[PDB]
Structures are given as C-alpha cells and as structure tokens.
Copies of this chain bind each other. A is one copy, B any other.
Amino acid sequence: TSQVRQNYHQDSEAAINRQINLELYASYVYLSMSYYFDRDDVALKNFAKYFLHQSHEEREHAEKLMKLQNQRGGRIFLQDIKKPDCDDWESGLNAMECALHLEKNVNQSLLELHKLATDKNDPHLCDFIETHYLNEQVKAIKELGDHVTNLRKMGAPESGLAEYLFDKHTLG
C-alpha cells in the first residue's frame, strides 16, 4: 500500500522487524554487562566502558534497520525487549564469552536474513546486509575471540591480577 514499495516481499519485512528486536536485545544485554562491572565489588572500569560502547553501537544498528524499513515502504512493528539471561556475569572472561556467543547468534540471524533476501531476489536488501552488518559482525566476533584467548592465557578466571591488567592494557 506504500507509494515507495517495490520488490520488497512481506517475509523480508517480517524478518527485518525480528532483526530489529534482536539488535535491541543485544543493546540491553551489553547495558547489563556494562553496569555489572561498575559494581563496587567488581570495579573494572574499562570493562564497563567497553560494554557500554557496544550497547550504544547495537542501538545504532537497530536504528539503521528501522531506517531501512521505512526506506523500502515496510512498516515497523516493535515487540517486547526481553530482559538479559543473567544479572550476575561473574567475571570479565565469562562476560566476554557470553558476548562472543551473543554476537555469533546475531550473525546467524543475519545470515538467515541474507538467505531469505536472496531467495526473494531482493538485491538491495542483500547489499544493505552485506555492506552494513556482515563485516561488522565478523570484526566483532574476531575481536571478542582475541579478548577471550588473551584472558584465558593470562589465567583470568582464577587470578584477578590477570583481569586487572587486561582491563588497563587492552581495554584501557
């Protein structure tokens, strides 16, 4: 019914709305993680800053998807943003592993979205996903994997000195 809509299938619109919800959920998870490390009994300021930055970037991803939905003449339908799985993230390493797993889930959702856009012969949507989301996801996953590897090699779970020094030198 939109005057601008062209070659934009309904399944693509629904999947874009689902992806919007997933990006908002990721922003919420990162917000929770950020303020876990601000606790007086955790007190790792650079971990908190890192996760707050990630939360803001995920909000940006969601807003770019909403802009895309309006550009193609689809209609945005928002849903509840579910609370994060954990309230206590238990360590810097555990938070990094959870973030890695979350970003891999988001990547899988984006790949399914790209496959749907391909099956519907929507080159603009495929290009939008490739240009703005796929490489960003690969970069984020690689960075999180590097952080997890370094924390593990330092002996992070047992020794708080490892997490302290990683906070200052890598995230600082």
Contacts and interface: CB of A to CB of B under 8 A. Distances in A.
Instruction: Count identical subunits in the complex.
Output: 6
A66 interface: yes
Contact of A121 (B59, B115, B134, B161): B115
A76 interface: yes
A134 B3 CA distance: 17
Contacts of A129: 123
Contact of A73 (B35, B40, B82): B40
B41 A3 contact: yes
Interface residues of A, number: 80
B164 A154 contact: yes
Interface string A1-41: 01110110000000000000000000010011001001111
B149 A41 contact: yes
Given A81-B28, A124-B138, A146-B43, A67 B87 contact: no
Which of A28, A31, A108, A139 has most B Cβ within 10 Å?
Answer: A31
Interface string A91-110: 00000000010001001100
Nearest to A123: B114
A71 B4 contact: no
B142 A4 contact: yes
A168 interface: yes
